[PDB]
Design a protein around this ligand. Structure first.
Ligand code: CL
Length: 294
């Protein structure tokens, strides 16, 4: 079955005046595997995947600014704020070449960094990542209303900040098996005080849906252009029915993305790590050795 503990020693690093928490295990020689969570999650989302990979490779899984066990400065938490902190995080640890394991807003941060540091990416493992959703018709029906409501300064603040609906509502609804209360409490913990939920609200207001916001739609389009023509080894996990990346779109991507291997996870929605962590972890470890050469 799936484990609910988080048996990792904390590591902390001062970045732009703020302390960021991260996981750090595995050997210190060789290429590190850098794990990037999104909304409303943290390193806790990678807990059952990292132990498949750490036997062979350094695993670094940071908590984004405002999230996890990282500090909570009073920010708008625009994507660009996460870009600044994440960039500084990576330089602070002296990372040179990396492999990237990425999801959701972690995938926006990770593709954006790769495009800008192409020579430092030896491979990308991705799942339920962010690319333009050009019309609301191209967002999943079952979540259209919910996300349209989230994308408002009145209703959307109400639901997400005041009633915690992204943690209590969206998260569990996008995992096919039922999250346990132990798991839910590890996800609830950073956001016990409502005022700290600002990143949970700004994030769905940053999604590139229906041309808006214009800056994110362009920056995402630019990293998707880069990806489509990069020969970097890519490993894409997908589920059924999925959310951002439904089966038919995973097949299309298998064909249109260079040097891409896809893996079918079975059932899942958005947080695929919670439904099949073992296959995700094992398939990643499997894949890493052949990335190593020049
Ligand atoms: Cl979001």
């Amino acid at each position: 079955e799936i484990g609910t503990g988080f048996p990792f020693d904390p590591h902390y690093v001062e970045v732009l005046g703020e302390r960021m928490h991260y996981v750090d295990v595995g050997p210190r020689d060789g290429t590190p595997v850098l794990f990037l969570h999104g909304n409303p999650t943290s390193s806790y989302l990678w807990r059952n995947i990292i132990p498949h990979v750490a036997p062979s490779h350094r695993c670094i899984a940071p908590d984004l600014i405002g999230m996890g066990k990282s500090d909570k400065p009073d920010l708008d938490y625009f994507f660009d704020d996460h870009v600044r902190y994440l960039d500084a995080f990576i330089e602070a640890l002296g990372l040179e070449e990396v492999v990237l394991v990425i999801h959701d807003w972690g995938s926006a941060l990770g593709f954006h960094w790769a495009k800008r540091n192409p020579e430092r990416v030896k491979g990308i493992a991705c799942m339920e990542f962010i690319r333009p959703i050009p019309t609301w018709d191209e967002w999943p029906e079952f979540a259209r209303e919910t996300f349209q409501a989230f994308r408002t300064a009145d209703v959307g603040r109400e639901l997400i900040i005041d009633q915690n609906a992204f943690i209590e509502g969206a998260l569990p609804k996008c995992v096919v098996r039922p999250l346990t209360e132990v798991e839910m409490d590890h996800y609830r913990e950073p956001f016990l005080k409502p005022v700290d939920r600002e990143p949970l609200w700004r994030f769905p207001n940053e999604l590139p849906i229906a041309g808006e916001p214009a800056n994110i739609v362009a920056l995402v389009e630019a990293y998707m252009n880069w990806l489509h023509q990069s020969p970097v080894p890519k490993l894409l996990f997908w589920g059924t029915p999925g959310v951002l990346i439904p089966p038919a779109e995973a097949a299309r991507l298998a064909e249109s993305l260079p040097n891409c291997k896809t893996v079918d996870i079975g059932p899942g929605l958005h947080y695929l790590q919670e439904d099949n962590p073992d296959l995700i972890g094992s398939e990643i470890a499997r894949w890493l050795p052949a990335l190593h050469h020049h």
